[PDB]
Amino acid sequence: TPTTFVHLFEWNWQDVAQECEQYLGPKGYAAVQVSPPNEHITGSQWWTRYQPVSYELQSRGGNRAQFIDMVNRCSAAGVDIYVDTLINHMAAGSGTGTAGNSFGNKSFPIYSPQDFHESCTINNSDYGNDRYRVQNCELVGLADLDTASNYVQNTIAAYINDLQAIGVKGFRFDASKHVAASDIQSLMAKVNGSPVVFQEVIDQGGEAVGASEYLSTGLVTEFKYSTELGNTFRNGSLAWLSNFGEGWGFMPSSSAVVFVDNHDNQRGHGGAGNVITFEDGRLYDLANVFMLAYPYGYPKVMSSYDFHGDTDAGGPNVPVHNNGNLECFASNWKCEHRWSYIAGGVDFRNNTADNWAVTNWWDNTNNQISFGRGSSGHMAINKEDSTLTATVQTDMASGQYCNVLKGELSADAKSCSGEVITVNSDGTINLNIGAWDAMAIHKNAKLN
Numbered sequence: 228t229p230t231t232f233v234h235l236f237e238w239n240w241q242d243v244a245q246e247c248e249q250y251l252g253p254k255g256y257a258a259v260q261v262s263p264p265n266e267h268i269t270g271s272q273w274w275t276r277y278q279p280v281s282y283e284l285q286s287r288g289g290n291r292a293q294f295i296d297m298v299n300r301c302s303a304a305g306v307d308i309y310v311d312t313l314i315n316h317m318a319a320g321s322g323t324g325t326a327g328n329s330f331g332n333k334s335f336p337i338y339s340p341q342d343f344h345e346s347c348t349i350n351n352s353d354y355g356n357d358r359y360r361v362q363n364c365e366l367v368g369l370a371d372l373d374t375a376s377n378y379v380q381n382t383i384a385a386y387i388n389d390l391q392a393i394g395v396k397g398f399r400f401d402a403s404k405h406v407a408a409s410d411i412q413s414l415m416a417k418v419n420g421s422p423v424v425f426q427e428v429i430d431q432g433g434e435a436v437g438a439s440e441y442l443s444t445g446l447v448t449e450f451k452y453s454t455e456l457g458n459t460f461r462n463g464s465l466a467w468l469s470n471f472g473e474g475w476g477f478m479p480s481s482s483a484v485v486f487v488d489n490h491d492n493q494r495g496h497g498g499a500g501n502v503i504t505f506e507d508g509r510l511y512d513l514a515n516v517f518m519l520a521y522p523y524g525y526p527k528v529m530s531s532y533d534f535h536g537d538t539d540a541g542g543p544n545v546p547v548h549n550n551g552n553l554e555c556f557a558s559n560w561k562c563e564h565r566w567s568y569i570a571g572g573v574d575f576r577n578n579t580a581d582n583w584a585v586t587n588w589w590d591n592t593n594n595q596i597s598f599g600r601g602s603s604g605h606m607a608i609n610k611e612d613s614t615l616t617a618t619v620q621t622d623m624a625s626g627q628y629c630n631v632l633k634g635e636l637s638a639d640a641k642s643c644s645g646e647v648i649t650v651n652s653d654g655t656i657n658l659n660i661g662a663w664d665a666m667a668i669h670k671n672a673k674l675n
């Protein structure tokens with residue numbers, strides 16, 4: 228069952244199409260969050276995508292034809308597309324867009340100065356004590372749309388409905404905290420059908436605008452997940468995670484979109500150093516294995532590029548699929564979604580979707596944990612400096628299974644490509660996990 232999506236940050240439409248066919252579909256990823264496909268300002272920075280000029284499908288990722296081709300090819304491979312949608316603002320200042328359109332002084336091809344709120348700046352202190360300024364003033368100088376205007380709502384809804392007609396199945400509502408929930412409710416009444424919608428709202432507590440306000444209009448990003456997971460994996464004990472989720476004050480599991488990191492927080496855009504990213508190597512593998520095995524939220528795996536310390540820089544000058552060779556894992560695209568522990572975690576989540584309970588939790592009071600998903604699967608993580616050799620109880624059928632974090636079951640189910648894990652006749656497993664390593668097994672990767 229599809230259970231996880233992925234953010235192919237800055238990947239062009241041709242690369243996404245090929246990836247859907249060659250990897251995402253076969254591996255079981257449910258969908259792909261793509262970078263903003265509408266017309267945006269020129270420039271090489273990754274953030275130019277967040278300054279719209281119009282809603283024409285001409286962007287850094289490609290043209291309208293290439294975008295449509297991607298949606299079709301991905302759909303045929305069984306993978307949905309989620310579009311990052313700018314519902315709060317238009318570009319700052321003046322200039323030119325990727326489709327040749329000019330703009331300036333709050334004047335665009337589709338909006339006039341009268342379609343925006345009067346200019347004011349959102350100050351950092353506004354987040355804590357002024358709801359009005361957070362929602363009516365400008366986020367880093369971006370022209371703030373009058374989202375209460377019938378014309379503005381019709382214009383945004385027309386873009387969304389047009390995308391659905393092409394085949395797009397979901398949408399990320401960027402900067403939702405900056406738009407009144409009531410305005411998003413009015414907008415949704417104009418949107419056809421019931422596409423998947425998730426709203427970006429950063430709420431760690433104490434804000435004038437809370438994430439709970441957006442639960443009726445769609446899923447909401449649970450940022451506490453990313454920060455608490457990073458803080459626990461770096462500075463705490465994994466044993467504390469036995470009740471991760473609602474128990475820690477997070478929103479309902481069925482309303483949350485979760486992640487280890489996202490495109491903003493992995494580069495300091497609102498995210499501290501406690502956030503775990505690809506730069507952390509094995510620590511990132513382990514954080515992802517926990518997230519994907521744990522039954523809370525709808526997770527999205529991150530897929531980045533090595534930015535060489537430049538937090539404003541755009542992606543590599545070479546495509547992912549380059550004349551027969553994959554530009555992954557090195558100093559260009561990182562392709563975390565292809566990392567064996569991460570892809571293995573996705574396979575585990577997909578095959579344990581029939582049991583959402585955490586069963587038989589075990590820990591050493593510190594950094595060694597193990598738990599199962601009933602008889603569907605079992606996992607263990609060792610973050611101590613000595614080998615984990617404890618015997619743990621599982622609800623799984625006795626036999627031999629492939630540790631899916633390190634290999635996979637062959638077509639004839641007579642061998643694995645990685646190490647084999649044995650479930651004894653009494654359901655126990657005698658662990659043998661080295662320092663900073665893990666294992667995951669499920670009922671559909673059992674040897675015959």
Ligand SMILES: [C]=C1O[C](O[C]2[C]([C][O])O[C](O[C]3[C]([C][O])O[C]([O])[C]([O])[C]3[O])[C]([O])[C]2[O])[C]([O])[C]([O])[C]1[N][C]1[C]=C([C]=O)/C(=O\[C]2O[C]([C][O])[C](O[C]3OC(=[C])[C]([N][C]4[C]=C([C]=O)C(=O)[C]([O])[C]4[O])[C]([O])[C]3[O])[C]([O])[C]2[O])[C]([O])[C]1[O]
Pocket residue numbers: 274275276277278319320354366367368369401402403404427429430431432434491496497498
């Ligand atoms: C990013 C984000 O943001 C926000 O968030 C927020 C934050 C911030 O930082 O804060 C806070 O958080 C946190 C907390 C939590 O709790 O904690 C604490 O501790 C800390 O400290 C903090 O940090 C809050 O809460 C929050 O909320 C918002 O909200 C969000 O939404 C966001 N995200 C999103 C959105 C967006 C937009 O679309 C994006 O962004 C990007 O892009 C942009 C655009 O491009 C950029 O920017 C750029 O551009 C601009 C224009 C500029 N500005 C300039 C100019 C001017 C005139 O023209 C002036 O005015 C100004 O000032 C200047 O500066 C800039 O510079 C540039 O850069 C950005 O950057 C980026 O990021 C994103 O991505 C999304 O995702």
Ligand SMILES: [Ca+2]
Pocket residue numbers: 315361362363364371372405406
């Ligand atoms: Ca606003």
Ligand SMILES: [Cl-]
Pocket residue numbers: 427448489
């Ligand atoms: Cl996000």
